[PDB]
Amino acid sequence: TTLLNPYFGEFGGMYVPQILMPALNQLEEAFVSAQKDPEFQAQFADLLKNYAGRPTALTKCQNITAGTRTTLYLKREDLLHGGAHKTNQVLGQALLAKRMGKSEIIAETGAGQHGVASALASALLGLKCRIYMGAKDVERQSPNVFRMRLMGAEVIPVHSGSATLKDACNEALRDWSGSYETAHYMLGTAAGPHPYPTIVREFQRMIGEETKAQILDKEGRLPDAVIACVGGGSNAIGMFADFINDTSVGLIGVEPGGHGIETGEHGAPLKHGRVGIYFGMKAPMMQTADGQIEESYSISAGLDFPSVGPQHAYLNSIGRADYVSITDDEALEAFKTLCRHEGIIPALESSHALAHALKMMREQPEKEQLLVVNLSGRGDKDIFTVHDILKARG
Amino acid sequence: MERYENLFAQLNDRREGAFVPFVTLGDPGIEQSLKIIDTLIDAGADALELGVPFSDPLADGPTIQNANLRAFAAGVTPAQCFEMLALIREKHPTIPIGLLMYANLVFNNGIDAFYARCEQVGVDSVLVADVPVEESAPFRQAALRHNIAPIFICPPNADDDLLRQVASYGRGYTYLLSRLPLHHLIEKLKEYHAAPALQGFGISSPEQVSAAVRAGAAGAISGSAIVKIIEKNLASPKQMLAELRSFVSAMKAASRA
Ligand SMILES: O=C(NCCOP(=O)(O)O)c1ccc(OC(F)(F)F)cc1
Ligand SMILES: O=C(NCCOP(=O)(O)O)c1ccc(OC(F)(F)F)cc1
Ligand SMILES: O=C(NCCOP(=O)(O)O)c1ccc(OC(F)(F)F)cc1
Ligand SMILES: *Cc1c(COP(=O)(O)O)cnc(C)c1O
Ligand SMILES: [Cl-]
Numbered sequence A: 001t002t003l004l005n006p007y008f009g010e011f012g013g014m015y016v017p018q019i020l021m022p023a024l025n026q027l028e029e030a031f032v033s034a035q036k037d038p039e040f041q042a043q044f045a046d047l048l049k050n051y052a053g054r055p056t057a058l059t060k061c062q063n064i065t066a067g068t069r070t071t072l073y074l075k076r077e078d079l080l081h082g083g084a085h086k087t088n089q090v091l092g093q094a095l096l097a098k099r100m101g102k103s104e105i106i107a108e109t110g111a112g113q114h115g116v117a118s119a120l121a122s123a124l125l126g127l128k129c130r131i132y133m134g135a136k137d138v139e140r141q142s143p144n145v146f147r148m149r150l151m152g153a154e155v156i157p158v159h160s161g162s163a164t165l166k167d168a169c170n171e172a173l174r175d176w177s178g179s180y181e182t183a184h185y186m187l188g189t190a191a192g193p194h195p196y197p198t199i200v201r202e203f204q205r206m207i208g209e210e211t212k213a214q215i216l217d218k219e220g221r222l223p224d225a226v227i228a229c230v231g232g233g234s235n236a237i238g239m240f241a242d243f244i245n246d247t248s249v250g251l252i253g254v255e256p257g258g259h260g261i262e263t264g265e266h267g268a269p270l271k272h273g274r275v276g277i278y279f280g281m282k283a284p285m286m287q288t289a290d291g292q293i294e295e296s297y298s299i300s301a302g303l304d305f306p307s308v309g310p311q312h313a314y315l316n317s318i319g320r321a322d323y324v325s326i327t328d329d330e331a332l333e334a335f336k337t338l339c340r341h342e343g344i345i346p347a348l349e350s351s352h353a354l355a356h357a358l359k360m361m362r363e364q365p366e367k368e369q370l371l372v373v374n375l376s377g378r379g380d381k382d383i384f385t386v387h388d389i390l391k392a393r394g
Numbered sequence B: 001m002e003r004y005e006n007l008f009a010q011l012n013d014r015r016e017g018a019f020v021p022f023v024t025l026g027d028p029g030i031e032q033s034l035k036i037i038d039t040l041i042d043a044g045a046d047a048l049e050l051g052v053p054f055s056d057p058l059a060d061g062p063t064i065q066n067a068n069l070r071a072f073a074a075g076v077t078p079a080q081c082f083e084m085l086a087l088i089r090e091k092h093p094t095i096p097i098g099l100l101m102y103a104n105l106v107f108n109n110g111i112d113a114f115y116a117r118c119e120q121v122g123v124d125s126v127l128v129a130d131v132p133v134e135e136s137a138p139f140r141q142a143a144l145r146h147n148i149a150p151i152f153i154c155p156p157n158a159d160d161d162l163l164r165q166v167a168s169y170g171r172g173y174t175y176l177l178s179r180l181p182l183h184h185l186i187e188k189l190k191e192y193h194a195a196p197a198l199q200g201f202g203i204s205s206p207e208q209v210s211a212a213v214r215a216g217a218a219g220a221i222s223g224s225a226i227v228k229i230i231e232k233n234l235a236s237p238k239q240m241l242a243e244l245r246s247f248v249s250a251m252k253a254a255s256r257a
């Protein structure tokens, strides 16, 4: 029994071992209560404003769109404390942890970004934080590991399986199954078992709410489309949620195309994988023909979650949202374009959303269109990756 | 078929508990795995629980995670596991054979087709580790349509609602987790006419088998302890079988009246 629907159409659910169901039920109850509690809302609003720096700007990009009929705004989640949108929801989940009487946080991280977000929220709220991270990722992500340790988090290298993101997810869940009386599992995207896709959306929805108010103020209308990259689905659902009932507003999700869909070296399960059951949910997966879970590939490690949030699979199935892909080279060109023409260094994740907007503009330059790209994070972290690729290609 | 029902009736007539080893199919290779399984049976296993290697075995601890990795290193696939299952059943007509599966492997090519394949090879039960009772309907339905018992975990803190659901939905046996007093859970499951309880998780010694039976369970399942013997003796296949035989013999002896 649950308080809320765990499915979005056919997608979603609570596919966890029996022992974890009480943890999910407790979390769902606490969330439902919190959402009705003005004190919880006020505390969350206070953190978002005074600690994280909300609202974030909505920046018009005249230089990029000159000579076309595209007007392009960027929602500046890159200016949020921590440099990406992840901060919004980790602050909300940390407050849920405290609401449930918990003093400890467990989190997973791939290349370290959610680990850092989890550690910063834990440090502020006085929670003891432990982060599981694949040994392969630890070795390659010294800066993020160091950030987590500076913020007082325990970083636990995971040597099991293939020692990457999905293995870190596995170890975090195993821990939580034993420790959930005292520890909250701070899941890093709008995916996994109910109630996480719901909670993460609601703790990211201020992205779209602010964007709506800002675009009404500046343009006097709603956008023609809002465009967001999709790794697991959190920044995209946060931008999309408040516009779902505005049927004129396009919702465009951009998965990583990697080296190209036809190569199979991509991270686009929603449009190019196959529905499976894993990570506690029924959703499109990267998987072998016989059902072993595989990896996503992208130039951007942040887009490597090998599935996708169930609400995106649902919005796609009903035709409310449209999902596309952008390759490594397309993302790289968008990264360079924003740096040179607007003086903003975008995350390579966010560069995928920008790249799709640039195509929308360039393919039909006389089409009048008002577009918002969710600029989910800043790209200082990516300058070594970008340097290395540009130098190798001469 | 009626393999669990016949087994428990026979054990009851002998005032005896069941001893049920778990191994991963194809660990450390197909050939050796088939020999391991014959050894477990020859040493006195009353039933088997058999895992199909899966990329992401969330519900498994380190010993079995390592078993999965060994099976993958040997190139073991679900298709090969089903070939193994048919061969095992052909050799051993009455021993109940249960699988421990992950949902994706059941769902992958269709839930109904999965259970039909289990029926074709002569499997008796399937426990899907990451399907809680709440999500179990299509799995239980497909299982029973194909003469397969769906097995559920009963956690030791299970509330009354969960006990009633497990009692109604499960067949073959109830998997009673080691980690309320177990004897009380065992009594409630009996009151609710549940499938006979097998205690599992952390069963590594003869005294734990006897304790399970004394508490009123129908028997005990042991995995990590069996698999550790495989891991310890990888370099010596013959010694591996000798030690498996000794261990299973001791564990089975602990179940006898
Ligand atoms: O995508 C996920 N995490 C994102 C981590 O973010 P980053 O540090 O940037 O890789 C993620 C983690 C867990 C999950 O479900 C479950 F818990 F069941 F495994 C689903 C998605
Ligand atoms: O302790 C556990 N396993 C011991 C029995 O399995 P195995 O060690 O493979 O025989 C165990 C740990 C966690 C768990 O739930 C979840 F997967 F969600 F984390 C279920 C079982
Ligand atoms: O039977 C199992 N393992 C062997 C017995 O445990 P151990 O002797 O500790 O290895 C076993 C049963 C169920 C399971 O997943 C879940 F609990 F979620 F259903 C994982 C392992
Ligand atoms: C983590 C991250 C993403 C991808 O995660 P989603 O849950 O799909 O939003 C995208 N952009 C940035 C900057 C990120 O840090
Ligand atoms: Cl309003």
Ligand SMILES: [Cl-]
Pocket: A390, A391, A394
């Ligand atoms: Cl150059």
Ligand SMILES: [Cl-]
Pocket: B164, B165, B168
């Ligand atoms: Cl019932």
Ligand code: NA
Pocket: A230, A231, A232, A267, A268, A269, A296, A303, A304, A305, A306, A307, A308
């Ligand atoms: Na993805």
